[PDB]
Design a protein around this nucleic acid. Structure first.
Ligand SMILES: [Zn+2]
Ligand SMILES: [Zn+2]
Lengths: 126, 128
RNA sequence: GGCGCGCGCGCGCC
RNA sequence: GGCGCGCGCGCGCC
């Protein structure tokens, strides 16, 4: 349906749009685009682990000045290296009303959840 | 012997608070404790945001009597003609007497024991 | 990241 | 007190 914005919960800076969100295995969420990479920084995860289909390499934080709010992790998924965000760190804002809402779990936030597609990235990267 | 009775220990200092046998439930939601033995285990002071709700008149927040703990245990209310303490299971360690196993419950609804309903006749029979 | 629990605390409703 | 929500810190399992 309509498009929404994701704002950092701590500093409230624009993070990304739900239009660029892709769902893996119906439970993990990543964001497509090179623009988004400017929004977060990556750093060594203290306790690296491997679950489901990923290999946890680091945690990502808000790229902003004094913010650095924990946004999620960065992993290895198949032939890719992608960030994985937790809805709990962001504020969802309806673009046409300014109405903001907070979700604790991805399952409680109902929007168009488009599945992650490897062919969708090799088309934008090649 | 009844091997369902449980001890309630202050979560912060581990001191004995009371037994589940002395616990009475008001309106299927609020839990209070019977007897003076329990009255010696806590202290109280006026509540910040309180008073009227349900059939209660929140008259104070109660804490663990141990001067080196003072853990929050609940509140004291005016219920009908009585003045009673109301406790939150979230503040205690549940220890099963028969096996010593300790458990932590965040909600009364999760703690399963023989829940005896509060009854004024009981209150009275013990006052005279 | 998902799920779960713990510790400390704030706010609303009754 | 019950119920809901949020803030900060930590742990377990995958
Ligand atoms: Zn931020
Ligand atoms: Zn204590």
């Amino acid at each position: 349906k309509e498009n929404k914005k994701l704002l950092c919960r701590k500093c409230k800076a624009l993070a990304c749009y739900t239009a660029d969100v892709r769902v893996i295995e119906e439970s993990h969420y990543t964001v497509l685009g090179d623009a988004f990479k400017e929004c977060f920084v990556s750093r060594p995860h203290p306790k690296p682990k491997q679950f489901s289909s990923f290999e946890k390499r680091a945690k990502i934080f808000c790229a902003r000045q004094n913010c650095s709010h924990d946004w999620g992790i960065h992993v290895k998924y198949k032939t890719f290296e992608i960030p994985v965000i937790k809805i709990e760190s962001f504020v969802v804002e309806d673009i046409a009303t300014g109405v903001q809402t907070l979700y604790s779990k991805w399952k409680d936030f109902h929007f168009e959840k488009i599945p992650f597609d490897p062919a969708e990235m090799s088309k934008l990267e090649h």
